[PDB]
Amino acid sequence: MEATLITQPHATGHVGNFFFTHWKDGGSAALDLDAKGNFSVSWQGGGYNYVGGPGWHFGDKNRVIGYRFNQDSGASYITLYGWGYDKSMPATDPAHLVEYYILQRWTYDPSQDGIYGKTFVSNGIEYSTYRSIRKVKPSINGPTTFYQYWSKPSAQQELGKDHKIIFADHVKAWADTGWILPDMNNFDASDDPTYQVLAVEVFNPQKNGTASGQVWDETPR
């Protein structure tokens, strides 16, 4: 029953066990989240940017993330989204801090700015990996230069059906091309923990819209 409605420009926190991040540079975009992992992002048409979603304040190599989306008017992309950070590595090494993405739905392919790594199968779904570089861009540790690891499926993951993201398969596929993730379970960065969320990302939307669904931890044992 516990639930929150996030309408301020930026916020992080927890609803029960679910971490969330929420960011917009303007407009009325709002994140609805309850303690069972049910969530909804509604956005406003215009020159606004939104990144937000529920998950966990830490990543885990062995996590399996389950989710279902019941609606997506057309977000720029819907993706698993997280960070790793090794405070001991030099900040001039872009592998010291990594943003990672496992795309699931998109109207814009954000991996088109990356270099191609490899192609693999996970949960019967074919994915291709990409790496891009962000130079002096915002991060959980302030502005710095860091890599982005992407995993893109060969088809959109459809609405109304449960899906699984077997995170270990993606970690391995990135590691197969030398793309190593730094520590995903720390608060060493200045601004945020090394979180991992199912993010709705909406950049300069032409219209009002909504993406809604539910997320859960599906790690087998």
Q: Which of 2, 99, 126, 218 is catalytic?
A: 99
**Which H helix or E strand runs over 173?**
helix 167-175
For residue 201, indicate whether it is catalytic. Answer: yes
Assign residue 123 a region: left if phi > 0, alpha if psi is -120 to 50, beta otherwise?
left
Residue 126 among the catalytic residues: no
**What span, in angstroms and rounded, lies between the C-alpha atoms of 69 and 76?**
15
Rounded CA gap, 128 and 26, in Å? 33
Q: Tell me if 167 sits within 8 A of 63, measured CB to CB.
A: yes
Q: Which residue in 2, 126, 158, 201 is the catalytic one?
A: 201
Please provide the distance, in angstroms rounded to a whole number, between the alpha carbons at the two ends of the chain: 28
Catalytic residue numbers, as ranges: 99, 201
